[PDB]
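Saturday, quiet lab. Running sequence design on the C-alpha cells for the scaffold JK sent over.
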C-alpha cells in the first residue's frame, strides 16, 4: 500500500527533510527520531523518543514498524555506522557508510585524501607551540591567516609572526585550549554546493550563501549560521562546471577507487576567487544544517522517489526540478547566543496553518505549549522572484512570533540585494 519513512535527527534540517518527505503521495507517515516541537506539530509526522547514537534501538524500531525508507540527518549516527548496520539487516537507508563518512569525520583523512587527488583546497596546519609555527610561516610567507576565536589576517611576516606567538603566549601545560591554526589567505566569496550521490552517479541539487556573524552588517562573533539564501549568485554556470570537474567528480571517483564508495548527500563548502575558480574549505557527509531549510522550500522533485532511486543505484535515470523563485531564511535565536542563553521560554505567535510560499522551520524547540530549547530556535523561510522580494516576505512572516529576549539579524541577504 503506502510507505512509512524514518528521519533520524532533531534539528531544522530534519524538520525540513521530514516535511518534504511527507509531501510524497507514496508516503502515509513520517517518523522522526527524536524530532522536536516543529515535527510534532506537523499532521503527518510523529516523534519517536530514541537517541541518534542509540543504533540498537533505531534498528529495533525500524524492524518492528517495517520502515520502507530511512533518511539520516546528522553526522553522529553516520560516523557510527548506522548505514552499515541497517543495510546488513536488509533495510533501505539513504546516507554514507561509516567509511565514506570519514570525509567529514576525520580531519587527517580528508587532508590526505585531497592532497592525493590534487583537489583544489586551502592549505593549513595546526600549532600548539611557536618555532615550528614560524618555520611554517617563513616557508609559506604572507599574506597568511592566524586563527585561535581571534582571526588575524596578516599582510606581512612581522604582523604574522607577531600574532602567531601572541595567541600562543601563555602556559600550555595541562591545557588543550592552548592552540592555533595557520591557513592560506583566500580573497574570494564563500558558497555551499550540495549534490546527491549513489556511488557512481551524481545528481546536483542546489547552492546557497549564508551569514555566520551574529550582528548586523556581519559584525560580532561567529555562529553556526544566522541566515541563508538560494541559489548562490556567485555560482554561475562556469563556476558550477568547474566545481563538478575539479572537485565533485574527482572526490566521488576517488572514494570509490579506494574501497569507500560514497552514497548520500555530499555538501561542499567552497571559496570562489575573483576569477571563478572554486576551492574546497570543508566537506559535510550530509545536508548542511541551516541551508537545508530555504533549499527544501525550492525543491519541486519528490525527495522519497529520488532517495529510493539512489538506493538501487539508478540516480542517473532521474532529474531534480527546482522553483525558479529564490528563497531566503532568517534565524530567530535566544538572547546571548553564540554565548550563554536561557531556555524554557514560551513561544508566542506561531502559525496555526501552513501557507503556500513560506514556512517556519523549528530547530531548538520542544513541547512543554512550545518552549525554547537551544541557541538557534527558528528559521522563517520565504520564496520571492528576487532575493529582495524573498527577504521582504520572510521578515513579514515573522511579525507575530516572539519570546523573552528573542532576536535576529535584520539584514539577511543585504550583500546579494545590493548585488
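Result came back. Writing it out in full:
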Amino acid at each position: 500500500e503506502f510507505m512509512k519513512v524514518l528521519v533520524i535527527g532533531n534539528g531544522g534540517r530534519e524538520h525540513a527533510l521530514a516535511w518534504k518527505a511527507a509531501q510524497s503521495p507514496l508516503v502515509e507517515t513520517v517518523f522522526v527520531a527524536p524530532g522536536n516541537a516543529g515535527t510534532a506539530l506537523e499532521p503527518a509526522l510523529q516523534n519517536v523518543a530514541i537517541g541518534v547514537t542509540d543504533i540498537p534501538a533505531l534498528l529495533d524500531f525500524a524492524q518492528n514498524e517495517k520502515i520502507d525508507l530511512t533518511i539520516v540527518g546528522p553526522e553522529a549516527p553516520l560516523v557510527k555506522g548506522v548505514v552499515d548496520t541497517f543495510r546488513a539487516a536488509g533495510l533501505k537507508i539513504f546516507g554514507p557508510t561509516a567509511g565514506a563518512a570519514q570525509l567529514e569525520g576525520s580531519k587527517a583523512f580528508t587532508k590526505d585524501f585531497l592532497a592525493r587527488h590534487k583537489i583544489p583546497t586551502a592549505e593549513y596546519q595546526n600549532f600548539t607551540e611557536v618555532e615550528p609555527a614560524l618555520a611554517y610561516l617563513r616557508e609559506k610567507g604572507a599574506p597568511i591567516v592566524i586563527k585561535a576565536k581571534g582571526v588575524i589576517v596578516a599582510m606581512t611576516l612581522e604582523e604574522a609572526e607577531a600574532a602567531v606567538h601572541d595567541m600562543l603566549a601563555g602556559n600550555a601545560f595541562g591545557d588543550a585550549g592552548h592552540r592555533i591554526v595557520i591557513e592560506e589567505f583566500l580573497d574570494g566569496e564563500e558558497a555551499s554546493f550540495i549534490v546527491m550521490v549513489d556511488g557512481e552517479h551524481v545528481l546536483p541539487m542546489a547552492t546557497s550563501q549564508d551569514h555566520k556573524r551574529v550582528g548586523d552588517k556581519d559584525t560580532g562573533p561567529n555562529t553556526g549560521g544566522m541566515g541563508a539564501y538560494s541559489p548562490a549568485p556567485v555560482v554561475t554556470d562556469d563556476v558550477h562546471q568547474r566545481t563538478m570537474e575539479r572537485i565533485i567528480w574527482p572526490t566521488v571517483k576517488g572514494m570509490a577507487a579506494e574501497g569507500n564508495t560514497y552514497t548520500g548527500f555530499l555538501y561542499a563548502g567552497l571559496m570562489i576567487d575573483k576569477q571563478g575558480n572554486p576551492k574546497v574549505i570543508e566537506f559535510n557527509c550530509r545536508f548542511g544544517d541551516l541551508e537545508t531549510q530555504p533549499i527544501m522550500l525550492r525543491m519541486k522533485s519528490d525527495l522519497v522517489e529520488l532517495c529510493l532511486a539512489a538506493c538501487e543505484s539508478k540516480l542517473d535515470e532521474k532529474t531534480s526540478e527546482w522553483d525558479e523563485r529564490a528563497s531566503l531564511g532568517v534565524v530567530m535565536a535566544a538572547g546571548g547566543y553564540p554565548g550563554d542563553y536561557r531556555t524554557g521560554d514560551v513561544i508566542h505567535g506561531l502559525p496555526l496553518e501552513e501557507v503556500a510560499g513560506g514556512k517556519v522551520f523549528h530547530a531548538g524547540t520542544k513541547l512543554a505549549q512550545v518552549v525554547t530549547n537551544g541557541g538557534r530556535v527558528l528559521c522563517v523561510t520565504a520564496l520571492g522572484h528576487t532575493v529582495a522580494e524573498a527577504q521582504k516576505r520572510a521578515y513579514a512572516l515573522m511579525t507575530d512570533i516572539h519570546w523573552d529576549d528573542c532576536f535576529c539579524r535584520k539584514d539577511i541577504g543585504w550583500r546579494a540585494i545590493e548585488r
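Notes for JK: Residues 195 and 292 are 12 Å apart (CA to CA). Residues 326-418 form a domain with the Glycinamide Ribonucleotide Synthetase; Chain A, domain 4 fold (CATH 3.90.600.10). Ask whether to fix the surface positions before the next round.
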